[PDB]
Amino acid sequence: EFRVYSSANNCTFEYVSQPFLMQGNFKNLREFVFKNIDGYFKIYSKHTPIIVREPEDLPQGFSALEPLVDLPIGINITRFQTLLALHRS
Amino acid sequence: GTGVLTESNKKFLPFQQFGRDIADTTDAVRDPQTLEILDITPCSFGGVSV
Ligand SMILES: *[C@@H]1O[C@H](CO)[C@@H](O)[C@H](O)[C@H]1NC(C)=O
Ligand SMILES: *[C@@H]1O[C@H](CO)[C@@H](O)[C@H](O)[C@H]1NC(C)=O
Ligand SMILES: *[C@@H]1O[C@H](CO)[C@@H](O)[C@H](O)[C@H]1NC(C)=O
């Protein structure tokens, strides 16, 4: 189901991946970098399981980020937001 | 260029295609057809003294 939109219009190419970018208390770490240079909209990502901490802050470590997708789309991208999904019980 | 192409054991990342050196000289290259990592090394050369 989709709730963030109701309609669309004419736009550019769409890319699609078959997998996903996704006791049980062991937290994870999903780092992302959205850089827009020379027209190409580059995106980096790297996942690593981290130990659950008390303050739930950034772990004291080092992990390189690897590219996973490149899109030659974008004209003026000086704004962005985020989207979450709540579990309706 | 020119050089012997052998099967190298360089653990190339998926998004990586080429491999350079200190002098920006290509040492390894990924085969476009098959997923294989070769290496570019000249065969033999040296000075000649008489
Ligand atoms: C549709 O194409 C026009 C072409 O002029 C473009 O200006 C517009 O941004 C595109 N997307 C829309 C209308 O959502
Ligand atoms: C992008 O938007 C900002 C503010 O809305 C504006 O100052 C700037 O000129 C815009 N750039 C382009 C290329 O449209
Ligand atoms: C290359 O293309 C030919 C064309 O028929 C095909 O038979 C072959 O399996 C392809 N090889 C690879 C590695 O894609």
Curated annotation (Swiss-Prot), chain A:
Region of interest (Disordered), residue spans: 18-25
Phenotype when changing residue 30 to S: In strain: Gamma/P.1
Lineage: superkingdom: Viruses
Known glycosylation sites: 10, 76
Effect of residue 2 to L: In strain: A23.1, Omicron/BA.2.75
Record function comment: Attaches the virion to the cell membrane by interacting with host receptor, initiating the infection. The major receptor is host ACE2. When S2/S2' has been cleaved, binding to the receptor triggers direct fusion at the cell membrane. When S2/S2' has not been cleaved, binding to the receptor results in internalization of the virus by endocytosis using host TFRC and GRM2 and leading to fusion of the virion membrane with the host endosomal membrane. Alternatively, may use NRP1/NRP2 and integrin as entry receptors.
Subunit note: Binds to host ACE2. RBD also interacts with the N-linked glycan on 'Asn-90' of ACE2. Cleavage of S generates a polybasic C-terminal sequence on S1 that binds to host Neuropilin-1 (NRP1) and Neuropilin-2 (NRP2) receptors. Interacts with host integrin alpha-5/beta-1 (ITGA5:ITGB1) and with ACE2 in complex with integrin alpha-5/beta-1 (ITGA5:ITGB1). May interact via cytoplasmic c-terminus with M protein. May interact (via N-terminus) with host bilirubin and biliverdin, thereby preventing antibody binding to the SARS-CoV-2 spike NTD via an allosteric mechanism.
Record protein name field: Spike protein S1
Organism expressing this protein natively: Severe acute respiratory syndrome coronavirus 2 (2019-nCoV)
Gene name in the database record: S
Swiss-Prot record, chain B:
Recorded superkingdom: Viruses
Function: Attaches the virion to the cell membrane by interacting with host receptor, initiating the infection. The major receptor is host ACE2. When S2/S2' has been cleaved, binding to the receptor triggers direct fusion at the cell membrane. When S2/S2' has not been cleaved, binding to the receptor results in internalization of the virus by endocytosis using host TFRC and GRM2 and leading to fusion of the virion membrane with the host endosomal membrane. Alternatively, may use NRP1/NRP2 and integrin as entry receptors.
Subunit (UniProt): Binds to host ACE2. RBD also interacts with the N-linked glycan on 'Asn-90' of ACE2. Cleavage of S generates a polybasic C-terminal sequence on S1 that binds to host Neuropilin-1 (NRP1) and Neuropilin-2 (NRP2) receptors. Interacts with host integrin alpha-5/beta-1 (ITGA5:ITGB1) and with ACE2 in complex with integrin alpha-5/beta-1 (ITGA5:ITGB1). May interact via cytoplasmic c-terminus with M protein. May interact (via N-terminus) with host bilirubin and biliverdin, thereby preventing antibody binding to the SARS-CoV-2 spike NTD via an allosteric mechanism.
Identification of the protein by name: Spike protein S1
Species for this entry: Severe acute respiratory syndrome coronavirus 2
Included range, full protein: 548 to 597 of 1273
